[PDB]
């Protein structure tokens, strides 16, 4: 549309934004007043990166978030645990002096040795088994590049292709290679059980998932560790991060096992070439739309806003295109955590997402998704469809769903309605869990047993929050989930 | 056409070699010498862009000699040359000592049109004397690349009073933007006329990137100058293409008029981003590109496409998707500015842009893209356009590898390009300046022959070259398009 | 489909036939045993043509039909009154001798005169006012053809274009001309009120409708004559017959006023040229599908079966194409009434209709109709849509609707579901009224107040009639009509 | 394209003159003389059909002379000539005295293969000696145009026992049908071979309607005869088209094989209606027509199309829709049998069929019909087919009035016809027999020239004639299709 450029974005659209915003917490927004600012700017989920920090540091941040939650009772804030995961780092050298590198020049599994310019160490014990002859290795996030020449029993020789400067204990990438480190170590075990399960968080961002069995392994740890919840298994969500090629190869199995997916473009950018990232992003998002599971696009989405009040023109389109691709969530990393403009970063991402949503042709998007699902479908999914179609046919303002699990709210979100999906539930854990579901606003109630009562309250609260007026239609969906009804707002 | 193999199976060299999206590179200190210009060609540069908002005719003339010397060292390449005008602009005045001033949020700042007065914290001057009549109450006025945001409180006779929104420190002679307002300054002043006539027309460049086009009348003014000045072309008017730069809302509002009048369009995202909210850029880009596709006019997406690569050998993830999406939006050309002109990694920037473009093209569903365009074009069409899109459908229906067009002007090649065939378009022409002109046309490669009078000889010569260049194999089909003595379409077999 | 030729038509499809069959009653099938045969062959509505016969003759036929109804309680038979309507006939001659005609040779409004070879009479008093100079006139159903030469005050001269033989008091047609006779005369007044309203029939086939005002005139007579129903206005259906060009010109207004439409091809064939009939048929049917009102295709649909056991190959396709065009009803005239093979005529029409219905692509047909309706729609029509879509998405066997008026049953029929539409109602007048609705089977019950009870009975009766098995899904629709539910068959 | 004006606004004479659907007329007593044959041409007859299930070579030769004499009296018309073979058939035997027999429902009737035995109520004879091995237990056996329905109880060695279903009276030598069964009789016997070689090939007819084709092998047998007999064509094999008649379920089952092998298809609805349930005819028609459209082979819809018009000057309403729907189904030709051969109103029958066909064509959405066919054809296609459908799309895109094809065989004209253009196809050829061959091709008109060597002369001559025939006006566009020396498509303007 042409007038969509000239006519400004209305306050109604930005307030009723559907794409969820995951803000990473850091020194720039660690206190309570800053987190309230992020909620006002439009935060959906708070992300805690356990790659750095300790339990005591993150626990104080957890208390700040929850204090910010009570200050804004009308909003709902999810809390995510992002694990460090498996990691590959180089060894020590002098250890003081950093070794100089040159083109045309080794690596050993013996981690306890003083590495020189001729030879270095590696923490990954199965380095030679993974890398074959010819395969490349990237020390210090792509600043140093080498190729595998020989494959020894306890070592692997390689020839450099650039004059690097660093370094001591820098990271490593094995592009196009399987990493046989355990998905969850003792550090991660301690993070998932004694923090995520202990303090009852909503999401686990599982780093470096390479297959379906890695998700099952995390799923097993949750069931086994029911000692912070009195034997009751947690409903915590498993968001698998696809950080390398192996995850991309086994994406279908990973997607089936996991609750959600994060397209971790940062590490993917180090593993696959830059030309492939947009393809990887669009394809994985599309499959998550078909599967009916929330997807997250993350990393370098507005990174220039770390140093400035306004983003670059490439970042402007990147957010918009992520939403147009069908991304349920968009994440900020250093923009919120380490940046000097966290409120602007969230503000700009909120407004661009909202604009992108007004440029979606929902009628066409519905049938694009509807045709992608094989028939016959289960009853709840048939009801979910009809709710979206009926909402359009009568021009309803809201789709109200009664749900104890939140699953019905996700089913309706799958078919991408233009209306806001109002989820009615009994426990706050489901409401926080639906902060990665696109276009869902949750009302927590004392009970959801009597339908007519719940529907009347939901409509009343929606009317107070200015999401519907008298006479307007609303699609109600609940059990006799096998029932759909069209109701008028009093 | 997006799937699993598109990620795991690496990008072929035949895909990057046969890239359709054209790459415009801004020339500057980082790539001003002959060695570098040859480097840019090998990495995929289609057009060299000379920015005349800086430098003088002497410095630019040396750069021109270097570009053309680089072209002689790569005779199998064709490089077009673009003149980018300075255009009209608004600057702040001078300051007491200067000696910058410190402004604060909530402050009431005055902006005077008296350009000779020494400015201070309370009051500064502006070079644009029609500032009060261009601005309304509540209008936003940006100063110094958006650093200082101010809002209009009262309008005077020769001054304006604004409310400073943010605390910043401004110096002397800093640029100014008026979001949502028309600027009443000549698009072509005396310096611009000198650059157009005594450089672009004189030394025979191929494109004029016309800055700050606000309406179709602006394009006609440039059109009038080209027709009135034939001093350097022995009487015959130049065929230089006019690429209009849409930089503000006025250009966006009058886009259809501008597009009709112009030979091409540049979505100048940089200045648009200052003149319009950041939420509107992606919309403004996608819409203007779509309209250009429907009009058959080449569009250029510009500015901050790989901005981080100015001081890094690897692009941002947002930049990695920005380039790809511009191609998928239907953009004919993509541009580099600081990345090539004054960055540390110009050859990487052109490489990354080239490989990302090529990968984006392999994800296009061409049959769907063809019918989308064909349906959007009003019927009935003229004869050449009907032949052009028949060449595209025929090419698909026989699985031809090349579409060959004999063309005196290049217009047929542009018509074929409009309907976005998967196969490479071979334009056969007699004039080198026509080949240079087609360097902003997506998916066109051009052979310059000594004559194009005999159709059979041109096609055989074209097929022989194309076969030698690995663009076709023996027994493959090619579509040939020309005139009886353009209205004819052949299907020919490669010998 | 190719195997659709080799594989025979199953008994399930013919039993669950959706297109309704209107049989005209006559000497060949006037008795009770014959009417039972017609019901067994698949009659939906019995048609009584009041162009001939008297009240005493038709009343005995009415008693025979209703006795045939009681003999087959599980089936439902509608009863239609087809009026004589306005008519144009020539005058007397000798009156004995019939006058010979020749090419190159008048007509007078003075009906009381002995017509010769030079001049004839006409019952239509406004003959000269209707026909202008040049317009053609057709005496004796197209056997004699003339053109209007002069237009006198009480007469109109015309020149013949064929050597005719007849005749005394033969019929007349004014192709492309408005006939200003009253839609309902004293004969028709007596038929509608003292037979249709008296004995409480289900349908009125209104002959020779030329505009919307003609239907209103009949609609006024029903409201005025409430003296055979104790002051309660009848719910009798008005089926307008488009028998000439004027009806075709004002079709939209006629269609809005009337309940249904009959494409009376017989008289249309005399008024418009043969090339136009298929266009007239397809266009009018299509508009009736969009309007959501039942349409009937009638006349010469299997006329060769009057003299033989099997039809001609042109008649074979005609029935099939009428169903594929979207006709709710198909009618037999002389095939049932005067033919020597009424049971075969009905049998062949039943099987061909059933085959045509199996060759319909319902998914595509739904969206063809769905897109034709403007949005936003009323709540009941939104529920009607979702019922049809949901039935397809879960592969339900039946669509059960609770309706007191029958209107909801017609709304679901509008969107052409592959499933049989089971209408649940309290009065038999609605069930008989739905015998012109495509694909509807009505269950009459004692009450329809408690939904759960009605749905259980409907499912139980459907299971007994072998229309659904245990575990199969069924779409239920009723009030809180604003509700849709998917239920399993016990 | 169906609406209000399509009913009220009458059928134009330009629509009936430029009718695309071809009309086949069976010749007989009602139209055997020269006067009548000229009448059929004026009313719209495209092909004259000679039915060789009756008459002898002498009587048919007189009819042929009359057809060709009628063609000389209408030189601006082109009339193709069709030979319809008798084919294999099954008859009952003789009866005691004969002296018909009276059969009753429930009776057990015996059918013997001993053809010399005198038949009675209990037992009759059959000319088809493989009757027992063709029929199975429960198979239906019809006798005397379906009058006697019987069902097989027991199968013997030289006999069959059937249960009579209905009470009827059968005479001597009445026809027999075996629904769902293959008949193992030669499709071409000695009489058929005599009619094909010593009449069809001898007197140079254009079409062989091959009766009772059950598989592709049957078509090849006829194909073998044409190649083996060149006595009357000086060594060169005849170009007579083979139109296979699908009359039973076996032909329906093996349709794809038959269609591939044949030059055209006739949906012989008459015998199909006896061999298959009446519910299946419309399906069998629509499906076979669709497959023929996709294959590019002309299909003919036949029998009882206007049956009532045998003894009436006006058709039935079912007949009025039957013709229209056959055209809308995509049928190239429609046929008349008794209506023309031995009816009272042959000239009315051809008139009504012509006007109804033309009206049906005006309701076709040609763009939709084009894309439906184009999508159903597997890609990649050969060069001539790609050019052909480019001619159709080009014609639409410039709003051309005619598509002109220079063709030595007529194959290009048939390829263009396949994609169903709204504009008339002008086939330009040197051989009158090619023009006659195209008389079963929908929407093709053909000019016979003395030479087609010079492309420019042929097109100019074509345009001049077409302009004179009111098929195009000055300045209108026409698509010209031919070969360089078929692979070329021109867009030309009418002078």
Automatic annotation (TrEMBL), chains A, C:
Cofactor(s) in the UniProt record: K(+)
Catalytic activity: pyruvate + ATP = phosphoenolpyruvate + ADP + H(+)
Keywords: ATP-binding, Glycolysis, Kinase, Magnesium, Metal-binding, Nucleotide-binding, Pyruvate, Transferase
The UniProt record lists the keyword Magnesium: yes
Class of this enzyme: transferase
Keyword hit for Metal-binding: yes
InterPro entries: Pyr_Knase, Pyrv/PenolPyrv_kinase-like_dom, Pyrv_kinase-like_dom_sf, Pyrv_Knase-like_insert_dom_sf, Pyrv_Knase_AS, Pyrv_Knase_brl, Pyrv_Knase_C, Pyrv_Knase_C_sf
SUPFAM superfamilies reported for this sequence: Phosphoenolpyruvate/pyruvate domain, PK beta-barrel domain-like, PK C-terminal domain-like
Pfam families membership: PK (PF00224), PK_C (PF02887)
Domain Pyruvate kinase C-terminal: from-to ranges: 381-487
Residues bound to ADP: 47, 49, 52, 89
EC number: 2.7.1.40
This protein's pathway: Carbohydrate degradation; glycolysis; pyruvate from D-glyceraldehyde 3-phosphate: step 5/5
Occurrences of domain Pyruvate kinase barrel (ranges): 17-346
One MF term in the entry's GO annotations: magnesium ion binding
The family this protein is said to belong to: Belongs to the pyruvate kinase family.
Protein name: Pyruvate kinase
Native source species: Cryptosporidium parvum (strain Iowa II)
